[PDB]
Subunit: 252 residues, 4 copies
């Protein structure tokens, strides 16, 4: 079928896009960098199995893909944002608006623009790539964490109404997902190179390692394949056992 | 001590302000209608125990209450919004921006404006009156429901950093809370007078009745009293046992 | 690899065993009826791809499968119990001891018996088929519901310690899962043939239908395949969007 | 009114019993130590404001109190158990049965024996003192943690059916609750005396301290007073912000 993966160069983009691609799907890709013709061309040449789009806005992206490839069967909203950690009184209100805009309004807008075609055909799959931070908040990251929670609930609430149209909706909230070269949010440097960060991941995850793009890709492909639509409304915590909780003194 | 209750004329406003006042707090009250001198003076006359303020924005409100009453010991962010039930494709992206601005940005702005003084003296209480809809979402109310979820997580996230400063943070998510003359969100009419609505309430809640302003106010006063600060980060589902789930055929 | 599926003739048993077998696993099957040679040989004849075992207790079952097939790579604890709906005062304390023995003690006993070999080689997968009732409890089923919750948490708790040994642990909590000829818990008759039951399902689930054995089996195979071990600790609500919550009067 | 607090000498017993007592309630108390006449007498003399009972079994305790003081209005099931931390393969199955018996079956039995009188009068309050471990499991404590989860869900499930009889049911799951001289579960030594344990509590809780018996007492008295029955079904995490999640390297 035809799928859309946003911010393909970051977060769970390449894992999602490529696995969906390997599955035989036509994968249209979005990314801020695709604004530049040079960037989009370099990407189109490196990945002939993918279809990079120049469109940046939600409804515009949806239309470009629909016209270009017939329709949109699967939506993978790979949302990102660059938040600063900071005491609540140190943030500017605009810092919260920014997080909400990028992490809640964006996925809402994408679904708002594609739900019509999916509901008429009574077929489609919606997947939000959110975050596992809501499951275990770190102090001083209130903007990002609460915005991600809003997106998680958005997905669950959507499943309630789209199910009547045979449209499953899921939310995958990862953490410690190896992002390789992308700074969103666990790049090879220093997460796989620095002893201190490696020790950190070892301590906070049950599997004692970072998650892989392959794992995220496998889940997205599985959910989009229609093999288990009965899981609709599910929020998947892709965080390898995180959070591991500090045990009493005397325990290893 | 001094407490601030926003949108006092609606939702959990009156219950919170009245009970807080009885507990001994000087209660500064905010409401959109207070922009008008005639509305503020009328309220002030009906409720001499309350202290209605005219300030409308978060920053100026906290400053105003601080000048008049020395400081802000308790913040009750009684947030409201007038949403409509709509299939996701029938909403305008603007309708979600509106819900988030009213239900997430606003309480964030209030805490952002008052956190400094509370942290400086290491004392204070923050209470968000959110919603129980995230616990059990209805079809076609994705905007309001997801935004309320963002606020709930915001409260829990904030509890993690403010606890270091001895400042507890809580979220009270009601549903089926009798709002008397306020349209937000269960006015006496029709919820207590129309056969179909009355029956609906007896069906969807375990206690088979609407929640009262007194119960909400009792909880607010209890949490702000300092009697149980160890509950910090808690999201209280004030919905009388809602949601009651449809049982198998034949069961009474 | 080798997988074990318990109570194979009921609940999520057939879906799990059949799909696991298709994936390439040698599937050892347990069932209470296998105590009888006539029942075991009949099953073995109908499903030549499956390997029915006669062993009934956890310890002997794992030992038996280990001798015959070398080792146990995947454990699917498909636990069942025959509860009755009863007001708490109408239950006998014995009825709860029974539910807990069947829904908590049993899976605990299986993991307790197989964990050693999995940890020694640092590989394996553990899947508990629990229930989604804890997500949305019905009145008068406190025994079964609370016991299933104990099992779900058992799975999540186990994921924390076994992750160190590269052993993922998951819980699949279904509801409205078509059990075909099995009375546990949604047999084709009446759930797919009686007007009232059929209508009930369309009302309480988002997808408005029963879950299929194939969907459950797809999930089991996917989790045991090693494609997404990073989901360890996850409780999957396999209930098609259940529970759907009663909306206000007048709404279609 | 008349209340029953079990295992009064341990966990949240003294905080509950005494505060309920200070409120003017007739508080009948149970404790294993009360088996010995000497023990019960020493307690009766030290606390004339409390009514220690010799009965040990659920139904027996309920009858003794009912006959002695007319009826049972409030039930505070202060359940305890002494679990060992241990890899799942190192536990004996009996270790899980023991935890379940003490943490699930006991509270179930108490409610099973008192629900009748409360439902006929259509008045009463049920409070389970469980644990916050299910909210954030430590590795190698699978028996205790999962049993507590079962009790938490038991309370929520019970609220669904008892609400029709105006009977609120709550679960209070504490952690890091100062137990003073009781070994269940955070005695003064070494939790308040040892620098290492003090540093631990400081790190894992948001309020950076142990919870107090007064705080637990205040919540139990509040819930039993009937001031906020609309919170029925609520599970209260009385753990002071726990769990605090390890932040990235470089963060304070
Ligand atoms: O900004 N951060 O520090 C941050 C940290 C972790 C994540 C996880 C969800 O992917 C996102 C963002
Ligand atoms: O707009 N509605 O339909 C609505 C319904 C219920 C609530 C609950 C949170 O108080 C708010 C709004
Ligand atoms: O006994 N019942 O009524 C019952 C109902 C629903 C389920 C769900 C978990 O598969 C099990 C049992
Ligand atoms: O046995 N332990 O190690 C233990 C630890 C913590 C608690 C918390 C719930 O009160 C109970 C038991």
């Amino acid at each position: 079928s035809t799928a859309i993966v946003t911010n393909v160069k970051h977060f769970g983009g390449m894992g999602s896009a490529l696995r969906l691609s390997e599955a035989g799907h036509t994968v249209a890709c979005h990314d801020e960098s695709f604004k530049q013709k040079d960037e989009l061309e370099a990407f189109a040449e490196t990945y002939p199995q993918l279809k990079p789009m120049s469109e940046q806005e939600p409804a515009e992206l949806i239309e470009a893909v629909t016209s270009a490839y017939g329709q949109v069967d699967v939506l993978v909203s790979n949302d990102i944002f660059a938040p600063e950690f900071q005491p609540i009184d140190k943030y500017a209100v605009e810092d919260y608006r920014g997080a909400v805009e990028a992490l809640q309004i964006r996925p809402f807008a994408l679904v708002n623009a594609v739900a019509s075609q999916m509901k008429k055909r009574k077929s489609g799959h919606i997947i939000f790539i959110t975050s596992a931070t809501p499951f275990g908040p770190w102090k001083e990251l209130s903007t990002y964490t609460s915005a991600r929670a809003g997106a998680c609930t958005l997905a669950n609430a959507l499943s309630k109404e789209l199910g009547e149209y045979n449209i499953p909706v899921f939310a995958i909230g990862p953490n410690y997902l190896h992002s390789e070269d992308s700074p969103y949010f666990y790049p090879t440097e220093p997460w796989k190179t620095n002893p201190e960060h490696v020790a950190h991941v070892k301590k906070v995850t049950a599997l004692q390692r970072l998650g892989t793009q392959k794992e995220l890709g496998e889940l997205v492909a599985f959910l989009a394949s229609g093999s288990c639509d009965y899981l609709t409304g599910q929020v998947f915590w892709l965080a390898g056992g995180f959070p591991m909780i500090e045990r009493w003194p005397g325990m290893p």
